[PDB]
Subunit: 474 residues, 4 copies
């Protein structure tokens, strides 16, 4: 029975470089708004190219070949990750309050899902730190070769406003596990949760310069990370046309390793043989989750002709009963959207689909004054060539499409540019295997929908050393 901490103070507003709280070099300060009311919560220092340069120097130094962070036993790098989890657990009440206040997401969801995840992953990568193994290879001739997994160096990290803390956790944890020093840039709307983490990082005992958090805008602070000559690696996560400018700015600078976690459609495929009670509810929480604005989920839903009639009826009854309101209110399932820019971008696409063919089953407009609330929207009779089908909506809007054969859904769901996640609902083995295997998706869910070892391969680099031996034996 946990509840949000009243009179929440935003104590940490300064830039975190080299374990020190510093002001901005220009002196400029940007505003952070509560999306639930529109009201300004506080002000945060605005980092720029000058601020990045200080943060890279701090991270580069913290990484040199005599550093506290390099002399450290790998097992202890996990220990500082494990103690970080303790602090996130201790301050579970207040971090979720920030994530509910700043992000907009309901409080109970921030406590039971988001932070649970945040805590889980830190403990996970704490376990990995002293288990990243290389190999010994029996190459030809009188030689003996082996490999070390070693840290890349200074890692630029840019995240969005979707899951400010989870994105922070999913990017910080793997990097430190492998022995890197991090220069991170949280979203211009949601830097608060990332900023509080700075206090826990200092408290957990992370060597100075290891993690530098720089709040600010994208084309300013973020583009400075992408074009920085002293950064070894960038890891971006967000939108496609911003992602295209990242790899471009990297190739002209110092050819830093680029990793992108871009958006893209995510089709749910629901067959007739699946149980209706579970299939409807899991697909409803797979579109509307976190107000609908997440790259991990997908609004696109393909339903079989036989159960299409019943599916719509079940869906509309979940939308007419979904509680939408205050993020601090324990009854609310849905919160507000992030931006005025976002609020308007969704309505544009809703009113696109209205005049384009699809049937407005429920909702459509905004809920009312203050915040960026949109009443739950469900569309029926959606086709592939519609604007709502190609460009995915990033809000509380779900599309219900009709399908006949198994070969039909495969080619219709696969029709997407780089980036796909799949979700099948079946009790037929042969159907599930066929669909999951033919999906051109990174991740395929079967009878579920909610969002490892390969994760840390992008945060360490191979180093193959070979030695001449006097005589080789097997």
């Amino acid at each position: 029975l946990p509840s949000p901490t009243p009179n929440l103070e935003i104590k940490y507003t300064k830039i975190f470089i080299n374990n020190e709280w510093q002001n901005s070099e220009s002196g400029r300060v940007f505003p952070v708004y509560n999306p639930a009311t529109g009201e300004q919560v506080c002000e945060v220092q605005e980092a720029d190219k000058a601020d990045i340069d200080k943060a890279v120097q701090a991270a580069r130094l913290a990484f040199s070949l005599g550093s506290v962070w390099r002399r450290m036993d790998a097992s202890e790098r996990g220990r500082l990750l494990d103690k970080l989890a303790d602090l996130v657990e201790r301050d579970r009440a207040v971090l979720a309050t920030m994530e509910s206040l700043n992000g907009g997401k309901p409080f109970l969801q921030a406590f039971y899902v988001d932070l649970q995840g945040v805590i889980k992953t830190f403990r996970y990568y704490a376990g990995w730190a002293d288990k990243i193994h290389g190999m010994t290879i029996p190459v030809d001739g009188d030689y003996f070769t082996f490999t070390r997994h070693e840290p890349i160096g200074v890692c630029g990290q840019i995240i969005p406003w979707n899951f400010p803390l989870l994105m922070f956790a999913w990017k910080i944890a793997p990097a430190l596990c492998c022995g890197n020093t991090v220069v991170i840039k949280p979203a211009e709307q949601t830097p608060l949760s990332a900023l509080y983490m700075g206090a826990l990082i200092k408290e957990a005992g992370f060597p100075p310069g290891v993690i530098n958090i720089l709040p600010g805008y994208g084309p300013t602070a973020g583009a400075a990370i992408a074009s920085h000559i002293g950064i070894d690696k960038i890891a971006f996560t967000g939108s496609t046309e911003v992602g295209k400018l990242i790899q471009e700015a990297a190739g002209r600078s110092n050819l830093k390793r680029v990793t992108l976690e871009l958006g893209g459609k995510s089709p749910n495929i629901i067959f007739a043989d699946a149980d209706l009670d579970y299939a409807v509810e899991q697909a409803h929480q797979g579109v509307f989750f976190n107000q609908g604005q997440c790259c991990t989920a997908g609004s696109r839903i393909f339903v079989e002709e036989s159960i299409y009639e019943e599916f719509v009826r079940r869906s509309v009854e979940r939308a007419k009963r979904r509680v939408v309101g205050s993020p601090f209110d324990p009854t609310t399932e849905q919160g507000p959207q992030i931006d005025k820019k976002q609020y308007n971008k969704i309505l544009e696409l809703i009113q696109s689909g209205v005049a384009e063919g699809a049937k407005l089953e429920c909702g459509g407009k905004g809920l009312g004054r203050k915040g960026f609330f949109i009443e739950p929207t469900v569309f029926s009779n959606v086709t592939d060539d519609m604007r709502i089908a190609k460009e995915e909506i990033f809000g509380p809007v779900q599309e219900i499409l009709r399908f006949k054969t198994m070969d039909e859904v495969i080619e219709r769901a696969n029709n997407s540019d780089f980036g796909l996640v799949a979700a099948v609902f079946t009790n037929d083995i042969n159907k599930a295997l066929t669909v999951s295997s033919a999906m051109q998706a990174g991740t395929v869910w079967i009878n579920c929908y909610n969002a490892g070892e390969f994760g840390l391969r992008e945060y360490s680099e191979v180093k193959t050393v070979t030695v001449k031996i006097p005589q080789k034996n097997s």
Copy 2:
């Protein structure tokens, strides 16, 4: 459209040690029988303690630090294996013939199944040779520790008569892959296909003393290996009673590494939702394949009450039409059993099932004089406590058991001592996953009937170095 080689000659009948063909120290010679007629095929040299002693010395020398086989590149070890597959591929006709003539298994099945598995295995492990990797561990303090995966040494191997050539492959390939030297003992009844591999091993250009093949009996040849003080490792496969005698005789000698591969019942589970036409056929092939005498097979088939009536009625029609006769004859599905000992042991168990309540649907008796043929047998209304249910029959006899709930079969199929393989037939995801996860078995097949293989043939040697200063 392949066919057996007419007027086959068994050219290789001597002991294979150090790439030479040697006569037995005693001079004694044992017979090898054609299980389809009872006729004597040929006479093979009989290995004993003396003969095993010479074989170990050949393998110990081939494993020494200066040796060609140790100095050799890992990639070359796989090269030789790949050449061995080549030679088998070329002689696929005659090897299948030997396997058929000696082992009873019908020719086409030994060609397209057994030898396909032989060729593929050598090909597979040929690829593993230079890809056995150790690791580098980041251990606390100013240290750097790495592991080498190194061959154990002389590996003693004893196989049954189930799949004479396949069992030979499955044992030789991984051991040679890791760079060991072998002393192998093929079952007394079926040594022929193993001894031909002797020739191809020399022809492929394997260093002398790497593979030593010794035909002979169990308590003479086999037990000499298990008790031998100069053998580093033993890998046995066969009956449980003999397996218990392996580990006991190994512990009282040098404490050599033991890998047993014993029998054990294998339950086929068939739910109502699965397709009948496929289920009946694959479960039929799950019991009757290779004359029923295989450790990998499972005689007991559980069928959901709903389809039980139809399943038995289908299962009889596949046994009434099952062509049983000459292995060389291209039409025959079922060859003869291996032994008089086996032929009698099966018949005994059938008349147990008859006089204990189970319904003899078809078969039950032997076919005719000469050979060891048993006509296909289906038992209906079989319960768990019956003699035929507990001890698994090693022949062409299938049991069909009634089951009600899912919770029932899981407990009932779990109720075995140590040997388990599973087989489920379902179209339900939740049913197939919840059964496969709950089933206490080594392998579980769903709607049908590697790397971890070579872990038993190499030993880890972890080396740690003291470094001046540690950096990540």
Copy 3:
């Protein structure tokens, strides 16, 4: 500057089954001896066959398919291991005091060496719990195979008195990491450290029956674990002549998986180019550590003819300055031996070498009454054929041997039967690399003194599914 807890009373002296403190079924209670003074510390419940049976049934239940220990997320098995480490860290002073009083080992070594290891391993295996991965294999035909790494079941564990708590930690941690239930048997002389862990186990929040501790003798409680039909695996550590009886008892029982961790010599090799200051100190601590009685270390040390003269001089001065006395006294380097049985067995072998050829440089006799104290001993001019060289001494006695060439040591050090640990001291790359590779050993240390461990505590399960059409 940590101190032993003054009036340490043994609170936990009962048998730990199913998270409850139960008495002995027989009612008999055995005494525990302080090796520092010879006094009786306390009395502990003597477990027997009937005590084993209850513990097995308790561990079997906590492992059944519906159990809380089986439904538990693997990451949360890591959570209970990591929480256990906390409790050891919190009671670090208390548990080190028990290990010093009962084991005999100096308190500071118990706090900084023994218990640090204990904590570190519980933190290391906590991390592995949800990282034990199987694999997906692209096999031929329209199929899809994957492997599951699953717990074995009930695991019997028997450890010596060498590092009572470390041995407990090194055996408990991996087993639980893989989801097993453990029945462990600590040494008759050192059960106290193990039983206190029982209190930390229940406090940590381990499900009832998951870990069962049983204190007592060898042929009683130990053999009963070995010959138990309900135990799926045994893991023994100790002497070689008891390990031989373990495999035999297992093979005549239920053929449970056997893992033996037996003794065997551990040669140090010291070349002329090595740093004399570092080499003398590390080889001295490579014999005398934990009063000499450790299977992980080794008494025999080969020194090159060039530096042989100086080595003896440096070696005798480190023994003449080594303070021996009370384990609670912070100044003491060496404690007493464990037993009257041990004390006598060491002196027997000392005076053996005196009359056999080796020169008594120092030590030789005991220190006196109360406790089993032996003064540090060094023997010069030792050959391979001596009784002290073959049968390794398990006490505070080091041999110093002479070697001429490189090919000499490798043959002389290799000459051992099953069980070796090497240690090289060199600043020549080609010398170190050729010595460490040619050494027939399980572990080799260069200029000093994991993942593969948890494989013996899990079993592979391959599941293969038939698919409509296979694509790469």
Copy 4:
């Protein structure tokens, strides 16, 4: 005692697409020169955007879900690679000769060094084909998650003239092992060895469109690949500034996965305790191997002050006796350089080094009229700031520098941009392990220089599939 095939017939000169020899779409034909004499060997069909378009369509068809190459067993992909190695082995004489005649490499070196590498690589990846394993993860909750390793798709590969046939094998083999399809572009100066491989690809019985070979120029054929909207992945190896244009043009088209393999300096470090006879020989064959023009090689050598006098005196005697001449002649150690463009670029850098202080011990000038022979060159008393030290000379020019302490060389050798390969010569363990660990390189050789699993990680993409189960047990 092997020999080159006299009166060599260059039979294969056309474009290779769908196992069919096609003339160029434009019709144009470009010349291929013998670098030993300057004389024109033959005329090859000139590929361009039009030519590439067809090749991609062939590759895409060979990759579709129905295709033979897709339905094929993993082991049968290994079978084809092994048969290709068989055929290379049979044709070892002509493939070496083609390499020797076209690339300028001395025949006996090309037979025993290069083609041993070509054969051994096809053999090696044949073995990997059916051993690309995924995982099964024990993820929290009632779920079962497994991963597949699946092929990416159509792979675009561009290679240089350094090792025309080794580079071919090194790109083809891993990509084919993982089940991809290939569009490969050999260097304009050495396409012959790669084109001949076309015939052997068809002969081995590779499905049509699995390997499409296109000989041609960079800006035409090469750049058509990096821009194509239907190529999933690109692997480039060559010069840095061409690589900078690859990652950029890939990010402007379809965000295809980019793997670069650029050059860069490679420092040899020789300590006093090392054996002079072996060290001088291996460091000499380090620089001068394959006419000094290989990214794997390293021109700059640091020699300890104590032995510096002897090392020069030893190196000057090894260069004076180094027989340079005709590649077909068995005696010759060194062939000609590949280009007039390359020949000129090396000479420029030499007289740069002469005019900058360094001591010209031997060589400097070219050898004669016809071909592009430069006589073995040794520079003495070189410093870090010099033009020859920063930019690596891609020819037969070695540089010998002096150093005082271990700390000095580690800093001096680490001072490089991106690419690095190290080679230490010592008999001291503490010296070797300190340097090998501290060196900011990818590969480090100890006491040698010379000619795995991590190779195929770049040619397949992970696919996680998670299943919801009724109840989870251990």
